[PDB]
Design a protein around this ligand. Structure first.
Ligand SMILES: C[C@H](CCC(=O)O)[C@H]1CC[C@H]2[C@@H]3[C@H](O)C[C@@H]4C[C@H](O)CC[C@]4(C)[C@H]3C[C@H](O)[C@]12C
Ligand SMILES: [Mg+2]
Ligand SMILES: [Zn+2]
Length: 258
């Protein structure tokens, strides 16, 4: 292995192993609200997470992921810019070394303290491995975190982090309801983009919610107590695990709202 978020293996280095990290449809991007255009063709997002089945949470050395049972048409995303149905497979966050940075997307260059990614794959490709290779293979729902009042539905995630502090540690994480991580409004921006980590595959329809969720400083401070390293190795706090904005190139960001 090799890539990370360090000075010598970070975002500026990724293209050497993964040439598409310098591609035409890379994420994240800065969402320029001048540029972004209202598109009445877009429909309401449909987020159906009632039957979502979480399984476990894992520190993989880059972030922590909550994994779902994507076996049945349980938790699905559809509508908006999407054709057909996309199944929730995992979520994770990117966050900073302090509250003024951490998000991957930015809005008129404004950074948030963190960004949540709910990752879904297009059922027409049968499984995630096949889907990730296609231009319309994934849908990622991105949600900004700003520091304020606490988010009750995040508390179960924050409280489990102490038990998966180092790379490779996992914990059971059943009956977690990701609907508790959503803001009131589903107003969104959408554009075609990529995974924001290697292999940087250009397989993602990005749906970035205009409304952030508020989380408390205590909650986000718990993110920063995780470690990039494995147990018994020298301590490297897991912070600033975000990729900065990439060139928009020949893409238009559409808004679902006026
Ligand atoms: C790397 C990317 C997240 C990029 C981002 O930070 O936004 C994530 C999202 C979905 C992830 C995958 C899915 O969780 C399903 C697989 C789970 C396995 O444990 C590892 C490979 C596996 C195939 C994962 C690879 C990688 O961690 C993926 C591809
Ligand atoms: Mg890796
Ligand atoms: Zn992500």
């Amino acid at each position: 292995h090799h890539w990370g978020y360090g000075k010598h293996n970070g975002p500026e280095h990724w293209h050497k192993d993964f040439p598409i990290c310098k591609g035409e449809r890379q994420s994240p991007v800065d969402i320029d609200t001048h540029t972004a255009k209202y598109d009445p063709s877009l429909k309401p997002l449909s987020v159906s997470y009632d039957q979502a089945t979480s399984l476990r949470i894992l520190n993989n050395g880059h972030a922590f992921n909550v994994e779902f049972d994507d076996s049945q048409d349980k938790a699905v995303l559809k509508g908006g810019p999407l054709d057909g149905t996309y199944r929730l497979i995992q979520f994770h966050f990117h966050w900073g070394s302090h509250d003024g940075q951490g998000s991957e997307h930015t809005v008129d260059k404004k950074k948030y303290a963190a960004e949540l990614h709910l990752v879904h794959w297009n059922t027409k490709y049968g499984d995630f491995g096949k889907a990730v290779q296609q231009p319309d293979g994934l849908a990622v729902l991105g949600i900004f975190l700003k520091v304020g009042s606490a988010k009750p539905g995040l508390q179960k995630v924050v409280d489990v982090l102490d038990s998966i502090k180092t790379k490779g540690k996992s914990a059971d994480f059943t009956n977690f309801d990701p609907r508790g991580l959503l803001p009131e409004s589903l107003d969104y921006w959408t554009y075609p983009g990529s995974l924001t980590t290697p292999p940087c595959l250009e397989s993602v329809t990005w749906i970035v919610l205009k409304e952030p969720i508020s989380v408390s400083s205590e909650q986000v401070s718990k993110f920063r107590k995780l470690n990039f390293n494995g147990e018994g190795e020298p301590e490297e706090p897991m912070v600033d695990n975000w990729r900065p904005a990439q060139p928009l190139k020949n893409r238009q960001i559409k808004a679902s709202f006026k």
